[PDB]
Design a protein around this ligand. Structure first.
Ligand SMILES: CCCCCCCCCCCCCCCCCC(=O)OC[C@H](COP(=O)([O-])OCC(O)COP(=O)([O-])OC[C@@H](COC(=O)CCCCCCCCCCCCCCCCC)OC(=O)CCCCCCCCCCCCCCCCC)OC(=O)CCCCCCCCCCCCCCCCC
Ligand SMILES: CCCCCCCCCCCCCCCCCC(=O)OC[C@H](COP(=O)([O-])OCC[N+](C)(C)C)OC(=O)CCCCCCCCCCCCCCCCC
Ligand SMILES: CCCCCCCCCCCCCCCCCC(=O)OC[C@H](COP(=O)([O-])OCC[N+](C)(C)C)OC(=O)CCCCCCCCCCCCCCCCC
Ligand SMILES: CCCCCCCCCCCCCCCCCC(=O)OC[C@H](COP(=O)(O)OCCN)OC(=O)CCCCCCCCCCCCCCCCC
Ligand SMILES: CCCCCCCCCCCCCCCCCC(=O)OC[C@H](COP(=O)(O)OCCN)OC(=O)CCCCCCCCCCCCCCCCC
Ligand SMILES: CCCCCCCCCCCCO[C@@H]1O[C@H](CO)[C@@H](O[C@H]2O[C@H](CO)[C@@H](O)[C@H](O)[C@H]2O)[C@H](O)[C@H]1O
Ligand SMILES: CCCCCCCCCCCCO[C@@H]1O[C@H](CO)[C@@H](O[C@H]2O[C@H](CO)[C@@H](O)[C@H](O)[C@H]2O)[C@H](O)[C@H]1O
Ligand SMILES: CCCCCCCCCCCCO[C@@H]1O[C@H](CO)[C@@H](O[C@H]2O[C@H](CO)[C@@H](O)[C@H](O)[C@H]2O)[C@H](O)[C@H]1O
Lengths: 56, 99, 62, 178, 459, 607, 170
């Protein structure tokens, strides 16, 4: 658009990109902790017709 | 004496910019700092944050617990059972020491 | 009759024997005290009325 | 309130102050005007009988005994004028006595509502700024050699000079400000 | 928590890569948006607490403390701008980075699931705190204030470190959830009594407990305003939060081990509140007021009742907003006449009518006017202590009387009476300053509307 | 129950709208004092409907409008007890407040902050109705503390006056000492009944309620200015006259009596509490009647009149007559508000003069104000068939004909004749006698904003007692059988008090100088209770705060024993170990000692 | 509406009325004016709202929790089993709190309803509040801020052992 404009307003992607990246890392934390998905006493059930996992 | 600056004099912030908002000596920077604080602090956080909190459902399962209590009070009364018993655990599930 | 002073109900000046003393030793003290007060008052007022003062008046006693 | 007190009260000053207090507390006891007038005249006769006491040492002793008598016959709840120290309206309007230097912070939109008042105020500020240096010099010139000093201030001796330290007296808030 | 912590970390490059004229507008705005995101932690539709990973969690105790932490960062930035406006650009950015660092460290501290992680973050906060006090404090006594603050903390923290290692060597973990479920009764040995004290002293010094509180009046009088805000609002709450987490493993020794600390707090709260009647320094007065309030928090945590924990949680949040407000109000007069002597500026209601309104509400909050959360916390603490021993009400009653006396004393002295009219440099209130006061007081009122959010773990 | 409930809720809504408008920019485009008077006026009219439906069917309500927060097994709900006490107090308070607010427009016309003054009075009224309609103690405590803060702000209205700010803090202090008792009751009921709701607290009837009832009594003692916590009420006359008419005579000062009326089911089964109330009330009704006999400020005489009538309410509560004590709140509100209005009418016309010694001849120069002043004084003194008669006469009957402490009985009757005496003091020195005011006479009592509000309360002071007495349901069974001298005791001692005072006042005109006997000085200086307690107590407590708490401990001994001794030790250890000569000969000698020590330890520890 | 079984209300018994005087009753006329000016327009607005609601009818369900093994059946140190049992106990404890609230609500409603007769006509609600309070105290009193299924069980066993001792001595 303009190097004077962009050199001033490009920093507005840092915190939003921290949020999106922080959300991405939190979903990766969910993936490492699926050892009891659909296996607890309280919640385990039979899978619905076209259902691969109870939560993702 | 040593070589040291004199203390600076008191300044009236409104003398140069009588529309000073407290944020900056540059007038345009000043008004936009004022707007960002009012917009993000009040229009966004305080209004939408208040709204979001207000519509958190069944906070700490308080609505479910009252709903569950009425179901049990109803059940325990038609069938003549006590509303609440002294023993949380059925005594048959407990093995006391012989002594 | 008679008024007995207490720490929380002090002696009036009119009943104070030291208010009716006119000895030149006392009158010299009283004049000396007023000279201190008057000089301090003058210093304060010169600061107070000065049209170039931009800030409050510093108060060394406080 | 306008005149500073002296280093000490002369014997005459102390007697006249007791006279004013004595009458005022008599008025509080009597209430009714005819009764007060009767006893006010009896009170003056007691101050007159010793008016020409030339002993001094006896005069001072007569002042002692009267003051002791006043304290015993004092009215517990004397009448106080409403605006006087201890009166009901004393300092009632202090919350409305805004100093003049507050106007220096008024916004231009605030000042534009009194275009004529703020033109006159500029003249008073210009007058104040020009007179200050002369005022300071006069007080420096008129200092006595011996250290004995009082709170009384001198007048303006020359022409076009204003009396020293006048701004805080002349421009003070009104008694009834609003 | 990573979706809260990562954007907070991005404030550091944002500060350093912004233009000098955009730094404050940038960092303040995104700091507000990060406060908005922390409200996601309040979406709690069940009674299972949020465990995001092995490392970070959030439950009804940490969630309010995390959100209050996130809210303070924008408020501290606005508070700092005016007195930093003479510093060069790099010094301003360095200051902002110190403020962001505390925000990051504190959010991680309140969400840590493991006690040595809590300890490391708990100790890390001293570095930015000390830097703020000593580099930007105004007086020569700021260096002594730094020493007291650092070493009152550290001497208590070393025994805490020993106790944490000892527990881990014995149990095999310092994870909080597992310590909760597998806890077993302690024997009442001398060795276990020393263990109790090692686990408690650092948190008690941090509150601070009466007797070891001298660091706090020193630290407040000398710190800059943003340092006072974070110290009174959040840093003292690390001790109370630490005590609540770790006391789960200390039973049943707290039944007798708590007596000296209940006594110091209940008597001490009268000594420190009575000091406020004769304090010439306004900042010191507010600081001693905090010590009196945190004495109540100590007592209610020590007796370990459902009411006592709930009253302590509310008071922690309410005091956090109220005391931070009072420091900001005091700093607005100081920035005009550059003195903290309370009796110097007077009759200020004459010239700052709206700021005087903020003063009155802060004072009414401080003396616990119902139905404020300030009163709600103090009330439930009083009920739990009365149950613990009916004679506690005597000391409670005295403190309530004294608290009203000094709270109204501060208002009468500074806002009322005749205006000290030699102060011609009393410039009108800044929009920023009036906004700062509102950002404290609206949440206090909103939390009074919905007090379920700050009840803590027991209710 | 929809029309009834809607009316109760609509009264609060109407009273909030002036507060809401204050926050908008609309307040400066309307006549705000006129708008606020109309809102209160309509709110009184709406309040008459629930009053009528109660007079008909006598049905009582518990209304819950909002669930605030549940603390496990304790639910806190905004709820309202709309019963006899609440319905009738609402109608009386709104009527009186309607007069005060209209009067304030004329009285405070010159005040540049009239809008804030009107707003503060409205807030006080809202907090007072929260206080009298609350169904639970926490909601009650909101109103209890609310009126305390509003009275503080209104007493210290002229905030540049040091004496006003001192009187404002004095009211806070005494009422905070009372609030300790309120909190004591609250903590006790939440632990022993698990509730602050009045319905659940009623099942405490059989318990021993000494601890909580002693707490309520202490709270009432402060709030109703009973002996011990009494001095703040006369000091509250620092505020503008409309403040004194509303708060410190008609509404705020009866909250203590009202609290003890609400908990009358528990106090009835506790003779110790009933005995204490009886004797506390009797001491207050006498002590403040003595004080009033020699006061010269017109507002102080009426203030002490209030404390003396509150003492009589406390005596009635001590006789187990809660409904009579409540009926005196309602009747007292009419003629006392009028008395303050009429004195404010006089004070305003005589250029802010409050001393009765500079008044006189008001009966001729201010005919309307004087006529209402006499009407109000006759209602206060128990003139038959005026509003005061329909409650005060029954109170005097009840005390004569009941098992009661005999000193309490006597001084209650002595204080009743003394009521006639200080009423005569105002009538003699203000309305009769000759002029004593400054010669420039600019009296004007023709404003409708002055005459109409007083005229509305003059009617209440004539007919309100009769109308209320015949509409309320029967309550306590009165004793109507007694000797003629017990039936006419109230009338006889009142009339006797007039003759004694009328005689003693005429003796003030004889040309004989008055002296200061020790009994009058006691009366004038208020038994010296302020001149001692307000000097010794703050002095001792403020001295300890500085000398002991701050100086001896925090600045000296807590410094000396912890941080300063630690610093000294390590500095001392530092200088003893670092003061080395730098001589290799000395170090090598010390290394020889190290070697020998290590060899000795090895030898002794050799198995 | 609500369940008349959970929140029982006695049937109303309102008299005739049988007016004697010839004066008109102002409450009667004010109610008729109220029912026209106020009640009638409010009902139309509500009926419009209810008509909109039926066009967008959605539903919600009360969640059901299957029972899991109690703390009594958990091996000590078995955190997976302790966790589920402890979470079950917290759910039950919460529901017990609301049962206490229902019983107190009945008690308060009955006292108000009975008025001067409350000391006689509230006997059943006062007895149920007394029984249900005894049972509550036995489960939960003195557990402390860290209350849990393990502490509740230890409290029960301590009481059972004392009851057994007293019975054995008999
Ligand atoms: C939202 C935006 C806010 C808009 C603010 C505004 O524009 O008002 C303009 C209005 C007029 O402007 P101004 O004259 O130029 O202001 C100069 C001074 O501030 C002069 O201001 P002031 O002193 O005249 O009025 C300020 C007032 C403060 O504001 C008020 O108006 C009082 C509100 C009292 C509580 C609500 C009613 C009760 O201060 C008080 O009087 C404190 C009284 C405390 C009463 C205690 C009662 C508490 C218990 C009741 C609550 C619980 C309910 C239980 C139900 C059962 O100013 C204000 O009202 C204050 C603005 C500050 C924010 C107010 C926040 C109040 C929130 C409610
Ligand atoms: C107002 C509360 C009083 C101030 C607190 C205080 O310093 O009392 C300490 C005191 C400590 O005991 P103390 O009264 O012996 O303290 C020393 C007092 N002098 C120096 C006068 C001998 O506790 C009280 O008794 C206060 C009641
Ligand atoms: C802040 C709170 C704001 C409160 C705002 C309240 C607004 C209420 C809006 C509802 C208005 C309903 C008016 C109405 O009765 O007719 C609507 C009208 C309906 O007319 P109607 O209500 O007169 O229908 C009469 C009744 N029936 C149909 C059974 C014969 O709505 C329409 O425009 C037509 C669609 C249906
Ligand atoms: C991928 C990224 C997605 C998110 C993008 C968010 C939007 C970023 C752009 C916002 C800034 C717009 C340009 C700007 O710099 O604002 C100009 C304003 C005034 O600057 P000035 O130099 O005085 O120019 C005068 C113009 N009348 O200066 C300002 O005061 C602007 C203040 C900016 C505050 C931060 C904005 C946050 C936006 C929400 C983030 C959404 C995610
Ligand atoms: C007094 C006048 C009322 C003004 C507020 C009105 C707004 C509103 O609608 O709130 C009502 C709502 C009450 O909901 P509820 O708690 O469920 O009530 C009990 C059961 N009915 O209350 C709410 O849900 C709103 C709760 C406030 C939410 C806060 C918003 C963000 C706060 C910014 C962070 C600062 C606070 C930091 C500490 C927070 C600790 C969690
Ligand atoms: C913090 C800020 C929060 C911002 C809040 C914004 C929330 C917006 C609310 C949108 C609500 C409407 O949401 C919409 O409602 C319809 C009702 O037709 C529901 O839709 C569902 O039920 C309807 C019932 O008729 C069916 O027809 C439809 O096929 C089905 O999907 C869903 O719930 C959603 O599709
Ligand atoms: C049990 C838990 C609590 C344990 C906490 C222990 C805290 C120990 C803190 C040690 C403080 C070190 O403090 C260090 O020494 C003293 C403290 O008096 C200060 O000394 C200061 O006061 C002395 C007089 O006493 C002055 O002469 C000196 O000029 C001044 O600096 C030093 O400036 C500071 O550097
Ligand atoms: C187990 C360790 C726990 C304690 C932690 C360590 C705390 C530090 C204590 C030792 C150091 C403080 O030392 C203490 O303060 C300062 C030095 O700073 C000295 O005080 C000195 O400061 C400066 C520098 O010399 C002089 O100008 C001053 O006049 C003098 O008083 C004190 O006389 C000493 O007692």
């Amino acid at each position: 658009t303009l190097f004077q404009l962009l050199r001033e307003h490009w920093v507005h992607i840092l915190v939003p990109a921290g949020f999106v990246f922080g959300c991405y890392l939190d979903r990766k934390d969910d993936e490492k902790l699926t050892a009891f998905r659909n296996k607890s006493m309280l919640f385990q059930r039979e899978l619905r017709p076209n259902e691969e996992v109870t939560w993702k | 004496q040593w070589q040291e600056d004199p203390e600076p004099e008191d300044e009236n912030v409104y003398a140069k910019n009588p529309d000073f908002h407290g944020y900056d000596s540059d007038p345009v920077v000043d008004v936009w700092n004022m707007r960002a604080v009012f917009f993000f602090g009040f229009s966004i956080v305080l209004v939408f944050g208040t709204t979001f909190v207000a519509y958190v459902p069944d906070y700490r399962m308080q609505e479910w617990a009252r709903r569950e209590a009425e179901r049990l009070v109803k059940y325990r009364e038609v069938n003549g059972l006590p509303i609440m018993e002294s023993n949380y655990f059925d005594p048959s599930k407990i093995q006391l020491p012989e002594d | 009759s008679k008024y007995k002073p207490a720490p929380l109900a002090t002696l009036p000046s009119t009943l104070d024997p030291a208010e009716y003393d006119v000895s030149p030793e006392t009158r010299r003290a009283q004049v000396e005290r007023l000279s201190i007060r008057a000089r301090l008052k003058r210093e304060y007022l010169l600061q107070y009325n000065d049209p170039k003062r931009v800030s409050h008046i510093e108060d060394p006693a406080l | 309130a306008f005149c500073a007190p002296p280093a000490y009260l002369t014997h005459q000053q102390k007697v006249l102050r007791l006279y004013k207090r004595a009458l005022r507390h008599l008025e509080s006891w009597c209430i009714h005007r005819d009764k007060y007038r009767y006893f006010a005249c009896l009170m003056r006769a007691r101050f007159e009988e010793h008016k020409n006491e030339k002993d001094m040492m006896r005069a001072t002793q007569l002042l002692r005994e009267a003051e002791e008598e006043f304290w015993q016959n004092q009215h517990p709840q004397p009448y106080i004028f409403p605006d006087s120290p201890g009166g009901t309206s004393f300092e009632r309007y202090e919350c409305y006595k805004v100093p003049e230097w507050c106007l220096d912070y008024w916004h231009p939109s605030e000042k534009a509502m009194y275009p004529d008042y703020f033109s006159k105020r500029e003249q008073w500020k210009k007058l104040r700024m020009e007179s200050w240096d002369r005022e300071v010099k006069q007080l420096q010139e008129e200092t006595s050699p011996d250290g004995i000093m009082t709170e009384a201030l001198p007048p303006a001796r020359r022409e076009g000079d204003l009396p020293p330290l006048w701004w805080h007296i002349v421009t003070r808030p009104r008694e009834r400000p609003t | 928590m990573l979706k809260i912590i990562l954007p907070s970390l991005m404030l550091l490059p944002l500060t350093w890569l912004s233009s000098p004229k955009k730094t404050w507008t940038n960092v303040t705005s995104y700091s507000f948006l990060i406060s908005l995101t922390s409200l996601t932690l309040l979406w709690q539709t069940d009674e299972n607490y949020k465990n995001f990973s092995n490392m970070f969690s959030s439950d009804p105790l940490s969630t309010p403390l995390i959100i209050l932490t996130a809210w303070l960062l924008p408020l501290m930035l606005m508070a700092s701008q005016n007195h930093l406006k003479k510093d060069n650009n790099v010094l301003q950015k360095l200051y902002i980075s110190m403020l962001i660092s505390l925000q990051i460290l504190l959010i991680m501290t309140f969400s840590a699931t493991e006690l040595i992680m809590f300890y490391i973050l708990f100790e890390a906060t001293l570095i930015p705190t000390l830097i703020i006090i000593t580099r930007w404090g105004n007086q020569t006594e700021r260096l002594n204030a730094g020493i007291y603050f650092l070493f009152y903390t550290l001497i208590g923290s070393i025994p805490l470190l020993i106790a944490l290692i000892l527990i881990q060597n014995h149990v095999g973990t310092l994870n909080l959830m597992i310590l909760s479920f597998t806890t077993h009764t302690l024997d009442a040995s001398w060795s276990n009594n020393l263990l109790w004290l090692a686990c408690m002293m650092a948190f008690l010094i941090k509150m601070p407990l009466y007797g070891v509180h001298l660091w706090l009046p020193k630290a407040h009088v000398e710190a800059p305003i943003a340092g006072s805000m974070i110290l009174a609002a959040i840093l003292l709450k690390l001790g109370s939060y630490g005590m609540i987490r770790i006391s789960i493993i200390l039973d049943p020794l707290t039944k007798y081990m708590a007596y000296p600390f209940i006594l110091l707090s209940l008597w001490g709260m009268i000594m420190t509140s009575s000091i406020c009647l004769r304090q010439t320094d306004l900042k010191s007065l507010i600081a001693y007021s905090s010590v009196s309030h945190m004495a109540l928090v100590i007592a209610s945590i020590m007796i370990q009742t459902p009411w006592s924990f709930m009253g302590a949680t509310m008071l922690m949040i309410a005091h956090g907003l109220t005391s931070s407000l009072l420091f900001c109000l005091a700093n607005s007069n100081y920035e005009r006449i550059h003195s903290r002597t309370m009796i110097m500026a007077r009759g200020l209601q004459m010239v700052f009518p709206l700021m005087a309104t903020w003063w009155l509400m802060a004072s009414l909050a401080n003396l616990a006017l119902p139905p404020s959360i300030n009163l709600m916390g103090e009330l439930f603490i009083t009920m739990s202590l009365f149950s613990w021993s009916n004679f506690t009400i005597i000391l409670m009653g005295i403190n309530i009387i004294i608290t009203g006396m000094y709270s109204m004393y501060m208002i009468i002295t500074t806002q009322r009476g005749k205006l000290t009219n030699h102060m011609i440099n009393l410039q009108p209130s800044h929009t920023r300053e009036l906004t700062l006061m509102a950002l404290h007081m609206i949440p206090l009122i909103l939390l009074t509307t919905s007090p379920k959010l700050i009840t803590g773990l027991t209710m | 129950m929809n029309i009834f409930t809607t009316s109760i809720l609509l009264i609060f809504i109407l009273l909030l709208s002036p507060i809401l408008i204050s926050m908008s920019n609309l307040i400066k485009h309307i006549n705000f004092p006129l708008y606020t008077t109309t809102s209160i006026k309509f709110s009184f009219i709406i309040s008459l409907l629930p009053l009528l439906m109660f007079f008909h069917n006598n049905m009582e309500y518990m209304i819950t409008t909002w669930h605030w927060v549940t603390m496990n097994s304790m639910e806190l709900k905004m709820s309202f007890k709309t019963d006899f006490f609440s319905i009738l107090f609402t109608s009386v308070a709104l009527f009186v407040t309607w007069s005060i607010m209209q009067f304030s427009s004329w009285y405070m016309h010159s005040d540049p902050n009239i809008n804030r003054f009107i707003k503060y009075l409205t807030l006080f009224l809202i907090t007072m109705l929260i206080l009298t309609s609350a169904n639970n103690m926490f909601q009650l405590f909101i109103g209890w503390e609310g009126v305390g803060i509003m009275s503080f702000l209104l007493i210290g209205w002229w905030y540049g006056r040091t004496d006003a700010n001192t009187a404002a803090l004095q009211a806070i202090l005494y009422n905070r000492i009372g609030d300790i008792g309120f909190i004591l009751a609250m903590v006790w009921f939440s632990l022993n009944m698990n509730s602050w709701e009045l319905q659940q607290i009623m099942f405490s009837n059989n318990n021993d309620n000494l601890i909580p009832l002693m707490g309520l009594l202490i709270a009432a003692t402060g709030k109703s200015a009973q002996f011990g916590l009494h001095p703040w009420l006369p000091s509250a006359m620092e505020g503008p006259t409309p403040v004194s008419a509303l708060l410190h005579s008609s509404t705020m000062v009866v909250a203590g009596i009202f609290l003890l009326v609400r908990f009358h089911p528990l106090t009835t089964n506790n003779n110790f509490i009933l005995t204490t109330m009886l004797c506390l009330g009797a001491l207050t009704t006498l002590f403040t009647a003595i004080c009033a006999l020699t006061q010269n400020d017109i507002k102080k005489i009426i203030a002490f009149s209030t404390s003396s009538q509150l003492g009589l309410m406390m005596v009635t509560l001590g006789m187990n007559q809660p409904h009579l004590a409540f009926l005196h709140i309602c009747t007292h509100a009419f003629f006392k508000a009028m008395l303050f209005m009429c004195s404010g009418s006089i004070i305003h016309s005589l250029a802010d003069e409050q001393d009765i010694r500079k008044m006189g001849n008001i009966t001729k120069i201010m005919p309307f104000t004087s006529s209402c002043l006499v009407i109000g004084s006759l209602a206060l003194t128990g003139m038959p068939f005026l509003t005061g008669f329909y409650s005060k006469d029954l109170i005097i009957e009840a005390i004569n004909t009941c098992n009661t402490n005999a000193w309490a009985l006597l001084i209650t009757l002595i204080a009743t004749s003394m009521t006639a005496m200080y009423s005569m003091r105002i009538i003699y020195f203000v309305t009769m006698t000759k002029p004593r005011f400054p010669p420039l006479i600019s009296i004007n009592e023709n404003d409708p904003d002055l005459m109409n509000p007083i005229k509305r309360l003059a009617f209440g002071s004539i007919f309100a007692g009769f109308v209320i007495s015949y509409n309320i349901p029967p309550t306590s069974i009165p004793v109507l059988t007694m000797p003629w001298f017990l039936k006419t005791t109230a009338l006889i001692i009142s009339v006797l008090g007039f003759l004694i005072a009328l005689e003693l006042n005429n003796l003030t005109m004889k040309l004989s100088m008055n002296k200061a006997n020790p009994y009058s000085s006691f009366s004038t200086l208020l038994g010296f209770f302020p001149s001692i307690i307000h000097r010794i107590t703050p002095m001792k407590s403020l001295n300890l705060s500085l000398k002991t708490s701050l100086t001896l401990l925090d600045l000296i001994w807590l410094e000396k024993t912890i941080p300063k001794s630690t610093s000294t030790l390590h500095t001392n250890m530092t200088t003893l170990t670092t003061n080395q000569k730098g001589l290799i000969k000395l170090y090598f000698m010390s290394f020889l000692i190290n070697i020998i020590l290590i060899i000795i330890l090895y030898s002794i520890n050799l198995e | 509406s609500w369940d008349k079984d959970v929140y029982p209300e006695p049937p109303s018994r309102t008299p005739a009325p049988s007016p004697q005087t010839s004066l008109p009753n102002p409450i009667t006329y004010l109610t008729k004016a109220y029912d026209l000016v106020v009640d009638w327009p409010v009902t139309l607005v509500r009926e419009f709202i209810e008509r909109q609601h039926a066009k967008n009818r959605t539903y919600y369900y009360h969640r059901q929790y299957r029972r899991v093994p109690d703390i009594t059946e958990c091996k000590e140190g078995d955190v997976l089993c302790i966790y589920e049992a402890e979470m079950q106990w917290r759910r039950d404890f919460k529901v017990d709190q609301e049962i206490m609230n229902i019983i107190q609500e009945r008690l308060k409603a009955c006292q108000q309803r009975e008025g001067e007769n409350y000391q006689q006509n509230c006997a059943k609600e006062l007895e149920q509040f007394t029984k249900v309070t005894k049972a509550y105290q036995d489960r939960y009193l003195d557990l402390g801020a860290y209350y849990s299924a393990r502490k509740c069980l230890a409290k029960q066993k301590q009481r059972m052992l004392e009851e057994r001792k007293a019975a054995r001595q008999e």
